[PDB]
Structure formats: C-alpha cells, structure tokens
C-alpha cells in the first residue's frame, strides 16, 4: 500500500460539465471549505477540463 491521508490535501472528484470526464479536484482545502465548495458544486457550480476549456 501507501499512505497519503492528510488534512487540506483533498481530492474532490467532479466532472467536466460538458464531456462528463473525470476531474479529480486535487485541492488543499479545510473541512469547511471542502464542505462549502461541496454545497456550491452540489447546487450549481461545475468545472470543465482543460481540453474543453481550450476547445469551447
């Protein structure tokens, strides 16, 4: 195995909102930031992959 389990360093995987491709949002976010941005992405926010961001 390996060991990488630390606070802040959190991998919140969402998607490219236009190709459904997996965006593992590797962030360094405290629990409450992670929670808050969870609610935003659950609500209305979403991201795009750099391929789609370059294409449209």
Q: How many residues bind Zn ion (CB under 5 A)?
A: 6
Told to check if 52 binds Zn ion by CB under 5 A, we report yes
Q: Is residue 14 within the footprint of Zn ion (CB under 5 A)?
A: no
Coil/strand/helix, residue 24: strand
25 binds Zn ion (CB under 5 A): no
The SS3 of residue 9 is strand
Instruction: Single out the residue of 19, 31, 40, 45 in contact with Zn ion (rule: CB under 5 A).
Output: 19
CA distances from 39 to 9, 24, 30, 52, 56 (A): 19, 17, 14, 24, 26
Interface residues toward Zn ion, by CB under 5 A: 16, 19, 21, 48-49, 52
């Amino acid at each position: 195995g390996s060991h990488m389990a630390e606070p802040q360093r959190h991998k919140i995987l969402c998607v490219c909102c236009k190709c459904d491709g997996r965006i593992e949002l590797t962030v360094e976010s405290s629990a409450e930031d992670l929670r808050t941005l969870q609610q935003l992405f659950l609500s209305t926010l979403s991201f795009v992959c750099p391929w789609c961001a370059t294409n449209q």
